[PDB]
Amino acid sequence: KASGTLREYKVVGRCLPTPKCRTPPLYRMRIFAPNHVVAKSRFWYFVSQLKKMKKSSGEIVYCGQVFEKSPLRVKNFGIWLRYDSRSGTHNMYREYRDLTTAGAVTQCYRDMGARHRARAHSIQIMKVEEIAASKCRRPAVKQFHDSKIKFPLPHRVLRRQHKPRFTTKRPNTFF
Amino acid sequence: MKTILSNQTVDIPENVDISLKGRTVIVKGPRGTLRRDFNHINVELSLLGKKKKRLRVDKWWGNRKELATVRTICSHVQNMIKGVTLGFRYKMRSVYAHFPINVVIQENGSLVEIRNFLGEKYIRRVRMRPGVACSVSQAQKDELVLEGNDIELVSNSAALIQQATTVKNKDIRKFLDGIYVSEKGTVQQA
Amino acid sequence: VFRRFVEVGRVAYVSFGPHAGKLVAIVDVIDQNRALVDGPCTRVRRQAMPFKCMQLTDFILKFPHSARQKYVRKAWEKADINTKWAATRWAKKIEARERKAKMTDFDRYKVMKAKKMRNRIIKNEVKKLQRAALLKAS
Amino acid sequence: QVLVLDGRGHLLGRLAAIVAKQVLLGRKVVVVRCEGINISGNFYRNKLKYLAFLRKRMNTNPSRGPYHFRAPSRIFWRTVRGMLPHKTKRGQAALDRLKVFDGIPPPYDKKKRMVVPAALKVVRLKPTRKFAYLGRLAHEVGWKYQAVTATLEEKRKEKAKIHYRKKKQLMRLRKQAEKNVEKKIDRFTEVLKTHGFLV
RNA sequence: GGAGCCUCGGUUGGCCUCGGAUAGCCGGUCCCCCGCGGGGUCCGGUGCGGAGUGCCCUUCGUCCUGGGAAACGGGGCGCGGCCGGAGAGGCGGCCGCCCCCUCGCCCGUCACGCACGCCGUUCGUGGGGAACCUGGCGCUAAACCAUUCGUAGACGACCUGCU
RNA sequence: CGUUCAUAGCGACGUCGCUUUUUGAUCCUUCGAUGUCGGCUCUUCCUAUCAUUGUGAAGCAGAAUUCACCAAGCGUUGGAU
RNA sequence: ACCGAACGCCGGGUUAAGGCGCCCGAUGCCGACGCUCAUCAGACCCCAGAAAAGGUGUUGGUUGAUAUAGACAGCAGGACGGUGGCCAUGGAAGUCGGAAUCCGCUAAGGAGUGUGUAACAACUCACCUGCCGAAUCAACUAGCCCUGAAAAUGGAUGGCGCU
RNA sequence: CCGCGGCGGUGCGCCGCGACCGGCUCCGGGACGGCUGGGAAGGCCCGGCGGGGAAGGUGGCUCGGCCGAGUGUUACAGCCCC
Ligand SMILES: [Mg+2]
Ligand SMILES: [Mg+2]
Ligand SMILES: [Mg+2]
Ligand SMILES: [Mg+2]
Ligand SMILES: [Mg+2]
Ligand SMILES: [Mg+2]
After folding, report:
1. Which residues form a coiled coil (chain B)?
2. Whole-number Å distance between alpha carbons of A6 and A9
3. Quick check: C59 and C84 in contact, CB under 8 A?
4. A162 beta carbon < 7 A from strand E?
5. Which residues pair with A65 in a beta bridge?
6. CA–CA separation, B19 vs B24, rounded Å?
């Protein structure tokens, strides 16, 4: 499993109809994946973990991308994690602050790869829940809960160093 | 993580005049001037109130190693205000078993000669830091008084004559000899 | 020592990106390096935008941190950031740089002749000031 | 046709890569004031790096072996020589093109010098990190002439202060002359601001 | 002042503050100190830098005559004087004097082998090295071999003496 | 174990590592030859430091002696077999 | 011997594996998010070097508590009585050690954590009050870095170097 | 011989241009389908309903000139959000 910018796919599936059971139950998951092919692959992975169902012994009924119901509203997201270390598998709970669920899960994959070297094949997303201003347990998220937030951009180091590279003025950083 | 703001205020009394050229603060008052250059410390130093009643120090978007510097800037400002108003007086006693340690100042308090430490013949000359006055006090047998404004200079000058009188190649748990710092206070109490 | 702060209501100038060279009202703060951005009369949609590609100005206007485009459009039109931005010296030298980029070759020839004659007249005046200052110091 | 780069505040390898590329591209570069070059990482790290470089020497004949140049200009020449293909004729021509100086000589003190922000400490290092001056590094390795260079730079800073005072006097004469003439160059000044000047 | 060989790079120049990066640039200095200048306090103008290397400076067709705005400016590697520059100077400014010109921006007036579409145009350059030539001033040798010495030495080399 | 006290100095029952200064193990180079051991002379290098410089800990009162660090700069002898 | 890919002589285009500071062709993206300070940093299968253990160095996670019934460290009153209880006589009125192992005053002392004794005595730790008044404590666990970690010619992420 | 009148190989060398084809690599436009028969958004707001950060208030304090700024306290909607 690799990553790009992630997308959220509602994938439902069931088993093939048999003479012993003509109407199998339908199972739904919310797979975070770059595209729908690997979304269906991770769906078969988690359903093969949970229930007795393989890809040849079943079918995906519908795989479709679900979109953010309010993309313009900033939200807190609590994501439950089951990852694998160099030692045995560990469980975590992370909180992020982003517009979309798939964006928060993307930030979660980059943050797990940055902090703990948890790769996308070792990370199993349990579930993501949107959170109000309360019910938050992380100070890096709770420091942005302010009615009148106020901070400068103190050491605003400049970029565009190489368009004209040789200059007379030493560059400024107080802006 | 990066903490969005760590602020701290220092309320200066009316006997103190402080100002700042960027991160270079200067504190003048009764006993003299004291300057300190807080460049390469990388904080914000605002100075507010009518007639500059308080010095406010900010750290914006700093993690733990730079959040640990706001209170040390505040502590250096407290020590500098204390050195300007009340001064620093360090008392240090000459502890000896048999040989009485002879201490004599030479110019005013600048050069200090230490003699008869463990019966040695080598005299110990110590130059004090510029601004630290050494004296032999009254109503006490063998005791040195270091007066000054800068706590850095006064305590470094105390550490020099404390480390000059050390016992070599013996059991220092038995040979308890030397000039040791006993009291740390001010010149005037107010 | 700071004067420009990331406040709800801060007007900023986009340096680079899709909406480059346009004004921005900061509505909310999302992260350390990402903000929530509206552009009501500057043809910029509501989206998130990092602090790297925006240069914050000294204009502030009053609206609460989750305004649904209407109250921030009314605050923009009430504070009148468009005419004040046109009267701002920095946008005047931005459009001076734009005129310098749009300078045609015939326009550049006219500018060069005006440079030549203006520099000759000002240099003669500088020489008269130098000889007058020499006579004054004499 | 000749770049004059200042070594003040510029990082060692960050400046040396740009200098090596611009000299291989056929351009005369004069890098000057090379004792003001600062190296990231603090002084004990950089000092033990150069002391290990001093320990690397030929056992049988050290005069035949590695030449350990102590001056900061020749340290900068060495760190550009380690980036140039100096075993070839174009690399030797690049070493002939490059001219490196300690302090700043009278052929180059009255020249406008350039600053590279892509190799500068304020742009490249975080302000909470540490660094070490190549002048202090060279003086505590064994370079002899920090103090003579300091006195000569003090003399030329006094001379440059006199020159900048004269430049400010010429500039106030220029501004008061523009104030006098802006009534008779009314249609000469306007035809520059309608095309993008003086605004 | 002259062709003539060889080797090449080029294709306006920038003639300068130190300095900070959680700050900085510019004024008069009503106020104060120090040796006309510097420094400190207050105040005022900009600061993604227009007192901008995203910059500045020079025009890069010619000459004729006949008007307007501006100007007493430029030249004869102009002659004499005052200097400054030493880190690896090798250049620049200021005065007295003889003569000549209408150069910079707009306009009326024509003419310049207008070589009939075809590529190495332009120049830093009176480019660097060698051989012939126009004159004025200034000049007169040193080293090595041979001899001698022994403070030196395998030979060379080194220290010496000789109108 | 150390008068009490695991760790001043040691440390069982177990376990983790470094070295090619010893012997093993293999046969990868050399059998149209790489002179096979010691001693004498001589130079350089390593630290896993015996002594000297600077230090910390002792069951360091002084003397003497152990443990440990920075450290190879300078030393490490004359002999009977 | 690894990855890619198999080969007539060439031109244009496109890639694999690898890379895009300079050597060295290309990130001279105004690249995104974090981690990391190393007085032995680290830098890409084979492959050319490292372990057990430890670290409030720093970044996260898991579990369990308490804080207005007024925390945590910080100045401060105490470890009494049945009880020299009980085997240990060679000595245990807490004391080399082991089966035991609660009441009273109660605010409170566990038949006790150490300093130390042929035995004592004495110094001294659960709990709370007087003062500062809101986030704190404890154990595991995963990243990067450090100790562990010492070889002989001067030495190698390939070099320069890089924060 | 004057004709480059028609055909054919062409020119001593250095070249340039035009149009057409094959292989490529890029750019500027125009309009179309599906979706959760797309999600939120842009405009006028209407008659109700509940909850929550905390505002032309109330209000302990602080900083200044009846007024402005910061902090905390119950919290309606005349700041807003679902
Ligand atoms: Mg002793
Ligand atoms: Mg042989
Ligand atoms: Mg041999
Ligand atoms: Mg050692
Ligand atoms: Mg013998
Ligand atoms: Mg394979």
Report:
1. none
2. 10
3. yes
4. no
5. A9
6. 8
- List bases in chain E with any atom under 7 Å of a protein Cβ: 10, 13-24, 26-28, 36-38, 41, 46-59, 69-73, 85-90, 94-95, 104-106
What spacing in Å lies between the alpha carbon of D76 and ligand 5's midpoint? 59
DSSP type of residue B47: E
Cα distance between residue A174 and residue B22, in whole Å: 13
Find the B93 Cα to ligand 1 centroid distance in Å: 26
Helix axes C105-137, D146-181, angle to 10 degrees: 100
Measured CA distances, B106 to B111, B125, B181, C20, C52 (Å): 5, 10, 21, 73, 63
CA atoms of D182 and D177, how far apart (whole Å) = 8
Which nucleotides of strand F lie within 7 A of protein CB? 44-45, 55-58, 60-63
* Nearest of B59, B61, B83 to residue B71 by alpha carbon: B59
Question: From its phi and psi, is residue B172 left (phi > 0), alpha (psi between -120 and 50) or beta?
Answer: alpha
CA of D89 to C1' of E128 (A): 23
Spatial contact of D180 and D189, defined as CB atoms under 8 Å apart? no
**Method of structure determination:** cryo-EM
In the numeric block, the tokens 């709970």 are attached to A93
Q: In what order do the strands lie in the sheet with A7-14?
A: A27-33, A7-14, A59-65
Q: Give chain A positions within 8 Å (CB) of C12.
A: none
Q: Does the CB of C74 fall within 7 Å of any strand H atom? A: no
Helix (H) or strand (E) holding D161: helix D146-181
Angle at the Cα of C19 (from C13 to C21), degrees rounded to 5? 40
Cβ of C114 within 8 Å of Cβ of D178? The answer is no
* Residues D30/D4, Cβ–Cβ less than 8 Å: yes
Of A139, A149, A152, the CB nearest to B60: A152
The 8-class DSSP code of residue B62 comes to B
What count of other Cβ atoms lies within 10 Å of the Cβ of residue C30?
19
Residue with tokens 């019910």: A135
Chain D CB contacts of A157 below 8 Å? 122-123
Q: How far is CA B27 from CA B10, B16, B156, D119, in A?
A: 13, 7, 21, 38
- Pairwise CA distance, residues D135 & A52, whole Å: 73
Supply C28's token pair. 């909310």
Structure tokens at D143: 């370079």
For the CA atoms of B5, B11, B17, B18, the dihedral, rounded to the nearest 10 degrees, stands at -10
